[PDB]
Design a protein around this ligand. Structure first.
Ligand SMILES: COc1ccc2cc(-c3cnc(C(=O)NCC(=O)O)c(O)c3)ccc2c1
Ligand SMILES: [Mn+2]
Length: 197
């Protein structure tokens, strides 16, 4: 699907209706394999998370992914709830070493630091939840039933960052790589800037 078709006909209505969106095969085997090579390079060369602006040497494919997310979000702007997106963080590359680690139930932005949307990219090739686990569970503002998201390769996930989506990362018994970008709300972020100082 083209960027604006994907955005308008899927991500926008889907975030409004559920607040959680998954897009599979986002960039294809070739681009995704390259992204994975770069991430595996970052970790297998040498703080289990690192921040990438996208123009660093060797992260050019990562910057490509960040740019693609940006394109989607540009097309969603003004249609994603009442938020106006005017910026985003750098990309956080995250590693779960595979020793039974995870992340306890948490909320990304519970103190109004400006982040509304969370964007995760999964680079895990031939990943079996049964054997390796590492599933992300989102409990969408209650909603009676949670959502289990496998970190399947070339998968792009969006969800609201505020209290609406509490989520946990179930223990990982294989090495788990992902890339996360957060998108800001203009007004919330401007109020946050003043409070921090
Ligand atoms: C010390 O400075 C910081 C600043 C921000 C940080 C954010 C996270 C974080 C938050 N959420 C998730 C998550 O929900 N991941 C779901 C998934 O991977 O599928 C995650 O993996 C990692 C961890 C450490 C941080 C350290
Ligand atoms: Mn999180």
């Amino acid at each position: 699907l083209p960027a604006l078709k994907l955005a308008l006909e899927y991500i926008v209505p889907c975030m409004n209706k559920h607040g959680i969106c998954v897009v599979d095969d986002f960039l294809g085997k070739e681009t995704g394999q390259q992204i994975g090579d770069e991430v595996r390079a970052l970790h297998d060369t040498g703080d289990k998370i690192t921040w990438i602006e996208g123009k660093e040497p060797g992260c050019e494919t990562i910057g490509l992914l960040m740019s693609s997310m940006d394109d989607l979000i540009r097309h969603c702007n003004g249609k994603l709830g009442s938020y106006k997106i005017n910026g985003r963080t750098k990309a956080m590359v995250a590693c779960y070493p595979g020793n039974g680690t995870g992340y306890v139930r948490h909320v990304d932005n519970p103190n109004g630091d400006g982040r509304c949307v969370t964007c995760i990219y999964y680079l895990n090739k031939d990943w079996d939840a049964k054997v390796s686990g590492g599933i992300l569970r989102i409990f969408p503002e209650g909603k009676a039933q949670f959502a289990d998201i496998e970190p399947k390769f070339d998968r792009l996930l969006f969800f609201w960052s505020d209290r609406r989506n509490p989520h946990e990362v179930q223990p990982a018994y294989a090495t788990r790589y992902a890339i996360t970008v957060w998108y800001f709300d203009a007004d919330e972020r401007a109020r946050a800037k003043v409070k921090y100082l």
